[PDB]
Design a protein around this nucleic acid. Structure first.
Ligand SMILES: [Mg+2]
Ligand SMILES: [Mg+2]
Ligand code: NA
Ligand code: NA
Ligand code: NA
Ligand code: NA
Length: 278
DNA sequence: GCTAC
DNA sequence: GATCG
DNA sequence: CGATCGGTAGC
């Protein structure tokens, strides 16, 4: 039999006893246009998050499906696309409330050409959504990835030093062996090289940040957010945990639950959802 | 598989 | 990137 | 371990 997983019910209450006031949802959608045809928007309508983060939109602003302008709950929409590479990468952030402040990229030209990061600053925290560069098949871009990890870390430490930080999206690492079905077989595969894993480790420590889902569920295995379309990986739960909500430690008294919407379809990733009591 | 996830 | 030599 | 086949979106 296969090692399967069932996300526990939503716990909508903080340790202090306080109820959740903010629901954030994050989803690598493997193409916004395709995802919307596969009815990803109707799932979002039902989860009704206050904030929705989208990675790999692979879509410029002038080709956004009109369904997005039929979202009364998420009226403030920000999109970033690559400078020159069409139909590649791309990130979006949708919000009920208008952020105090929004900006794009991590303040470093070399790393700001592929539309990977949006920063939205609110009252009590700063939200960053990101689609981290893949090291690629053959690890052809592993060296650049290392360069990214450093620049990204420095940048996030900067934000965090001024306000509590929430970082979500596809960080493109399975941190520990427990974060993917087949650890030994992928030790030289993008997403689970020693360099990427140690990069994620150094990110948690240096910023600093806490991995919300693993903070709440330290020993819960077989919890994944990505399955390759190939070889029926998903039905056999052969997956990776590549999508995170990383929190500033000052926010952990506000954390109610960090979820994995395993059953939501439309992409090779599934959505994740964060509950905070603010 | 054209590339790149 | 799961799979099989 | 390493070569191979092989889901998919969008160009
Ligand atoms: Mg793909
Ligand atoms: Mg992908
Ligand atoms: Na399980
Ligand atoms: Na398949
Ligand atoms: Na390629
Ligand atoms: Na086998």
């Amino acid at each position: 039999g296969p090692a399967l997983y069932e996300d526990p019910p939503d716990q909508k209450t903080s340790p202090s006893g306080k109820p959740a006031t903010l629901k954030i949802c994050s989803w690598n959608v493997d193409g916004l246009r395709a995802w919307i045809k596969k009815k990803g928007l109707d799932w979002v309508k039902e989860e009704a998050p206050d904030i929705l983060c989208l990675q790999e939109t692979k879509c410029s602003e002038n080709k956004l499906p009109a369904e997005l302008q039929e979202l009364p709950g998420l009226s403030h929409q920000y999109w970033s696309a690559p400078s020159d590479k069409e139909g590649y990468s791309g990130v979006g952030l949708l919000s009920r409330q208008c952020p105090l402040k929004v900006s794009y990229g991590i303040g470093d030209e070399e790393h700001d050409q592929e539309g990977r990061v949006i920063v939205a600053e609110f009252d009590s925290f700063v939200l960053v959504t990101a689609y981290v560069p893949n090291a690629g098949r053959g690890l052809v871009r592993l060296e650049y990835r290392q360069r990214w990890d450093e620049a990204f870390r420095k940048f996030l430490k900067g934000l965090a030093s001024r306000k509590p930080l929430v970082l979500c999206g596809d960080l493109n690492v399975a941190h520990e062996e427990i974060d993917l079905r087949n650890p030994k077989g992928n030790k030289k595969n993008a997403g689970f090289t020693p360099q990427e894993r140690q990069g994620f480790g150094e990110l948690l420590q240096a910023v600093p940040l806490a991995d919300s889902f693993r903070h709440l569920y330290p020993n819960t295995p077989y919890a994944y957010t990505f399955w390759t379309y190939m070889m029926n990986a998903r039905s056999k739960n052969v997956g990776w945990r590549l999508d995170y909500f990383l929190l500033s430690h000052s926010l952990l008294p506000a954390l109610c639950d960090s979820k994995i919407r395993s059953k939501a379809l439309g992409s090779d990733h599934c959505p994740i959802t964060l509950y905070l009591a603010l």
